[PDB]
Design a protein around this ligand. Sequence first.
Ligand code: 73D
Ligand code: 73D
Ligand code: CL
Ligand code: CL
Lengths: 187, 187
Amino acid sequence: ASKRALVILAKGAEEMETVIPVDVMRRAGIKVTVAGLAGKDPVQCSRDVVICPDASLEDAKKEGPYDVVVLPGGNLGAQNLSESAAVKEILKEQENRKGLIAAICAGPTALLAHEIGFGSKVTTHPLAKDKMMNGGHYTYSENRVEKDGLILTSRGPGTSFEFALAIVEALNGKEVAAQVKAPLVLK
Amino acid sequence: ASKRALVILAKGAEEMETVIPVDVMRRAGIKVTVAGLAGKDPVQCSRDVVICPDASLEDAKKEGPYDVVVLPGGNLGAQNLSESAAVKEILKEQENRKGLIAAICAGPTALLAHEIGFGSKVTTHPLAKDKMMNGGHYTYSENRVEKDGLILTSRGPGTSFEFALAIVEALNGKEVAAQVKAPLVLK
Ligand SMILES: *[C@@]1(=O)C(=O)N([C][C])C2=[C][C]=[C][C]=C21
Ligand SMILES: *[C@@]1(=O)C(=O)N([C][C])C2=[C][C]=[C][C]=C21
Ligand SMILES: [Cl-]
Ligand SMILES: [Cl-]
């Protein structure tokens, strides 16, 4: 059966961190739902790229659960995710069922906000480290991608391919990840 | 004065190759117009990400000329660009005024279709080489980014940051490109 991914898209999301994982996961045969935090309408990302979500988060939640929940970064996107009761519920449920949670750049600060994955080894964008580490609830890593069990984190736009391929490997295996990687012309 | 970029967005464009240069150029302070080939409506990219253009190409052309014209790849996106009389006119004008033209993945095959830049050293996605080289009108390169004068080409999603930063360097200089690069967490 095909794996399913929920990508939560908030105003101020980093568009590269949104699009690269969506595209790469779709290349891997994953059924991806781009879910609008605020509803069904187009989302203005951090650098003003406007993406039309596949569905509202409210609607996508009804089709859960998902094999991965993905949180893009962008400061303002991550803040919107961090402030959302709907996101809290989704992540709690995902953690409780031992489903994968993936977050990049400032995205992992939403895990802190929602008390998800405490004790995990995590990375973030360098500028988000102090926020993530407030209280010492995680252990910090400078690895480009950090996977500690079902908490998968990464650092920035420039680690987005690695992040996406790590998700692919987690869901569909090493060989599919390698197959998807080769046509991308990665270094 | 701020530099200006026209990114031409066609149905079936590779969304990563569209979004990474738009975002990176905006980080560099470039005024970027995402112009819809087919008009003002949202564009369904190759892996089903839907992007709302800033304007129709018809409207953006009236605000030209631009310091760079950017052609994303994606096979079907590149075919749409290759078949467009409007694109032909834009590229011819740009070449005639000695303005930069940038194309990635299958994107450079539109340069062939529109007889732009013949004699240049170019790269493409490996799968687009034979198409690009039909007639031997260019010299082929396996460099991740190839800049031959005002024709700047690149290979794939995985070279999109390098491609975007090369555009930035061409328009705004090495130091701005380095400044924009550092927060991205590139390898
Ligand atoms: C990234 O997308 C993000 O969330 N942040 C805030 C820390 C950031 C900063 C600089 C580049 C990329 C990102
Ligand atoms: C790229 O975006 C593109 O245009 N092509 C067609 C050659 C391609 C193929 C495989 C990965 C990326 C791209
Ligand atoms: Cl940001
Ligand atoms: Cl394609």
